[PDB]
Amino acid sequence: ANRFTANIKGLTQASRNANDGISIAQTTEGALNEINNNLQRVRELAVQSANSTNSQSDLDSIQAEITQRLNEIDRVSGQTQFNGVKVLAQDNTLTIQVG
Amino acid sequence: LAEAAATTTENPLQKIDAALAQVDTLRSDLGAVQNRFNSAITNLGNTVNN
Amino acid sequence: AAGVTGTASVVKMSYTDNNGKTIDGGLAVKVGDDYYSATQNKDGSISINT
C-alpha cells in the first residue's frame, strides 16, 4: 500500500507537470502565430515593391513599414517569456518529468 | 517673425514639393506605426488568454 | 581628427529621381565623393553634424 501510494502521488504531480508543459507550449505557439502574420504582411509589401512604377519616395514609404514590421518582430521575440523564460531568445531544452 | 519678400520666389515648385514630401513621409510613418500598435494588441490578447 | 584626406568645402544637396523630378535640401561638407551633413554656425561658419 505504501509503494502504491507513492506511485499515486508521483503520477498526480506528473499530471500538473504535464499541464505546465502544455501551457508553455501554448504560449510559444501563440507568439509564433503573430510572428508569422507579420512576416506574411512584409511578404505582401515585398511583392508590391517590384512595381518599377514606384518613385524613390514611394519606395521609401514602403521601406518604412517594412522596417517597422521587422523591428516589431524583434520586439516580440525579445519580450515574450513564460514565468521569466525567454522562450524566443535562445536555443534551449526544457525538462518536464512525467513519470 | 517673418520678413516681407522683396524679390519674387525662384523655383517655388521645388520648395512646395519638398514640404509635401516631408508631410507625406511623416504620414506614412504614422500609418506603419498604427499597424505596429494593432499587432501588439493582438499579441497581448493571446498572451492574456494563455 | 577623423583622418579624412582631401579638400574640405561646403555644398548644397540636390536629388533627382527616375521621374525627372528634383529637390534640394540643406547644407553639407563634401570631400571627394564623400559627404557629411552640415549645420550653420550663427556667424556664417559651418560645422559637421555628429
Side-chain angles (χ1 to χ4, degrees), chain A residues 49-68:
Chain A
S49 75
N51 291 286
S52 306
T53 57
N54 270 329
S55 84
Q56 283 78 353
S57 64
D58 314 304
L59 293 179
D60 215 35
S61 301
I62 172 169
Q63 175 63 56
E65 196 139 326
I66 296 163
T67 314
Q68 283 206 358

Side-chain angles (χ1 to χ4, degrees), chain A residues 46-89:
Chain A
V47 177
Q48 183 157 18
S49 75
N51 291 286
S52 306
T53 57
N54 270 329
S55 84
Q56 283 78 353
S57 64
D58 314 304
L59 293 179
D60 215 35
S61 301
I62 172 169
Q63 175 63 56
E65 196 139 326
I66 296 163
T67 314
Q68 283 206 358
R69 299 275 200 190
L70 296 166
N71 274 282
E72 175 65 357
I73 294 163
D74 325 294
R75 178 187 83 90
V76 277
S77 179
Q79 296 187 308
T80 170
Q81 58 78 25
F82 163 103
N83 212 32
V85 175
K86 314 304 182 172
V87 292
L88 292 185

Side-chain angles (χ1 to χ4, degrees), chain A residues 4-42:
Chain A
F4 290 174
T5 305
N7 302 1
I8 290 153
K9 298 205 150 273
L11 300 156
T12 308
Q13 190 171 346
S15 59
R16 307 311 328 169
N17 302 353
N19 244 321
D20 266 17
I22 199 52
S23 305
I24 181 163
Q26 164 186 99
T27 36
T28 58
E29 211 59 24
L32 314 193
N33 332 97
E34 268 293 17
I35 291 170
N36 182 313
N37 291 341
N38 332 96
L39 313 160
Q40 291 206 73
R41 167 56 167 172
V42 177

